[PDB]
Design a protein around this ligand. Structure first.
Ligand code: CHL
Ligand code: CHL
Ligand code: CHL
Ligand code: CHL
Lengths: 162, 161, 159, 157
């Protein structure tokens, strides 16, 4: 099944989208704690009209339950690593962090339908769903223990940036 | 004559708008230099899809051109001890527009006037509001005159839904 | 009403720079207490072992004596906040953080230096003693007299 | 190859903490050079007069001698960047900032301590040899590869 944006249109690669909580504003880079500034975690901004930092998806169609990479799109980057999402294996909390390799399997996630709402999804990694936990700046994306139910998943939509 | 938003609808008081450059993204609070963190200047973010921090307009519900208004940022968090209302830093050589003004005092009053080319395009006048290079990017400053649109920073108002 | 002494056993002088160093990381420095405000500033113990702290000068409403009204003012060539460098109590707060921006001549900014424990050149600030709580950067000074919950300090003369 | 001396005129030891302080603000510390990056870090003179600097240890690739390959490594219980505390040259900057994140065993991280001018116990760093100087950066003077930036070593404690 093709992933759809908030307008019900199918997701394309090489196309800028805000990832916005379906459940404050969009998802942005921020540090998870005071122990490291780089690499960056993924936090929901508490500011209501901030749309989030845009991402592009790499594989023109994006389909559900398929290996994809998510890369922030930004003209400025304060860290010496990449803008591609990945899992902090060395973190005892398994934060989703930047600095992944867009071609490597370390950076692969899958987009799956969430609950009933249309155009609502979750991310799953290999199967563990992406949830959230309290961090310094607010809720940060973390890898949950499993993907048995949507209970612990952080529901998202994709909004096309024009 | 009523000020209009990007949809051509007239501006209302107590209504959130993005002030967006007509000439990066919207206008946001940021420090102008390394000498002070508070109060805050008004900077154009270089990030292309950042809409700006919303403002509300007050009158000392219609907003009309060439009339005294106050501009106040709207935000659930504020890192400085002073107000979210725009004003002129009289004590700076640059005459930065800064936060921390009194919305009821005349120090915080600006006027919205039509700007050159393009529908629903405006400038602020107190002397027109222009911009200069600052630490984080272009910061709003009060110019010398309002003789022409040359030095004015053109803006539009986009309704926040 | 005996003189407060520095780590060299010399009596404290007014208008003289001292590091206030925890008597039990490095010295006391200005830092934000939480993510809700940058200004005004709280008083935090740096976790860095050889950072001496930001110097303060003491004023009196030349000896600094115990159990006497004094004001503490940070000494620095730059200040990123619009208010003063004088310590005071955040009168309306939960933890009653000690914060900058006080008036050194006003009673709002008065503290008293008293002996702490049965030790040597060790003190506390005070009815209510100055303690600490966990904050963003580390321990921050808060207003709590007994030396149970007091934050013990010493004074090191700066040269 | 004569021994480098600290501010007390005592010879420098390897694996010993020193402040590197400008020979005539306070000591040298890690800080960002500009708004383009937080990591890795530059080497800046703090403008605060009583800040001694962040301590370093010197390693040899127990006396530290002049005109010999040495590595400089900051010593700290915390580090906010994902790389090492060892000094090196930012080859891919036009300023050639001295930056952290070097390999203490690689030749990229080797400097030499040479006597500077007249003052006793005063030195410069050299990496044909190029001396370490300074340029204006965001917070203040930052060390760059080229006068030289004269330094002294103060024993911690
Ligand atoms: C590597 C350092 C880094 C840090 C520390 C942060 C931190 C933050 N980012 Mg991120 N980012 C960082 C890198 C990057 N970000 C982004 C892109 C974005 C976007 C698009 C957004 C964020 C936002 C946020 C904020 C999310 C929480 C919040 O809503 O607070 C509530 C908000 C505030 C308290 C206002 C903060 C104002 C100012 C932007 C930062 C404050 C300046 C002071 C230095 C604060 C430092 C305080 C210290 C003591 C902790 C948070 C301040 C969101 C945000 O709210 O920004 C306005 C947001 O929309 N970031 C990019 C791509 C350009 C980065 C590149 O390296
Ligand atoms: C009080 C201090 C204060 C400071 C220093 C800033 C600083 C900034 N604000 Mg502002 N703000 C501050 C107060 C507040 N802001 C806001 C609301 C906003 C909004 C909505 C936005 C800003 C944005 C900005 C940035 C505009 C420049 C840019 O385009 O960068 C390009 C972006 C970067 C260089 C990445 C910066 C990411 C991150 C937020 C952390 C930056 C802080 C650093 C870790 C510390 C210093 C690092 C240096 C070396 C870069 C700039 C970093 C804009 C922005 O871009 O934010 C993401 C923006 O959209 N501010 C509020 C209301 C809550 C404030 C209330 O106090
Ligand atoms: C709002 C302004 C302001 C803020 C946020 C701080 C914050 C801090 N001061 Mg303070 N200060 C501030 C104003 C002032 N300080 C000082 C003088 C001092 C001195 C002398 C010292 C401090 C120190 C500290 C630090 C204590 C915690 C620690 O031990 O970390 C330990 C060290 C680290 C965690 C490494 C990172 C340090 C780096 C300078 C912070 C970088 C900020 C991040 C890039 C932003 C990311 C923040 C995230 C949360 C958003 C803390 C970072 C102490 C310190 O440790 O300095 C290094 C210290 O010795 N301050 C003066 C007079 C000049 C100020 C005047 O305005
Ligand atoms: C991103 C990482 C990082 C950044 C941005 C800095 C930045 C700085 N360090 Mg460094 N450091 C950083 C990493 C680390 N430092 C250190 C250890 C030290 C030491 C021991 C010292 C520094 C000091 C400094 C300052 C030197 C310039 C000065 O004299 O300011 C003058 C001081 C001020 C202007 C007031 C202090 C500012 C306050 C700490 C926070 C400033 C951040 C702003 C509130 C946020 C907004 C930023 C601006 C751009 C809008 C400078 C602010 C020196 C210093 O002065 O600290 C107080 C210093 O003594 N650093 C360690 C080991 C723990 C790090 C590990 O990662």
């Amino acid at each position: 099944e093709p992933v759809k944006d908030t307008n019900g249109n199918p997701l394309k690669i090489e196309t800028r989208y805000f990832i916005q909580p379906a459940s404050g504003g969009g998802l942005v880079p921020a540090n998870v704690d005071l122990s490291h500034l780089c690499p960056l975690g993924i936090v929901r901004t508490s500011l209501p009209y901030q749309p989030g930092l845009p991402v592009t998806i790499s594989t023109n169609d994006v389909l559900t339950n398929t290996n994809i990479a998510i890369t922030f799109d930004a003209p400025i980057w304060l860290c010496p690593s990449s803008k591609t999402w990945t899992v902090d294996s060395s973190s005892e909390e398994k934060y989703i962090i930047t600095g992944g390799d867009p071609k490597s399997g370390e950076s692969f996630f899958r987009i799956e339908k969430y609950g009933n709402g249309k155009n609502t999804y979750k991310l799953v990694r290999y199967g563990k769903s992406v949830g959230s936990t309290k961090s310094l700046w607010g809720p940060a994306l973390v890898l949950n223990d499993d993907d048995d139910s949507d209970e612990n998943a952080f529901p998202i939509k994709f909004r096309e940036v024009d």
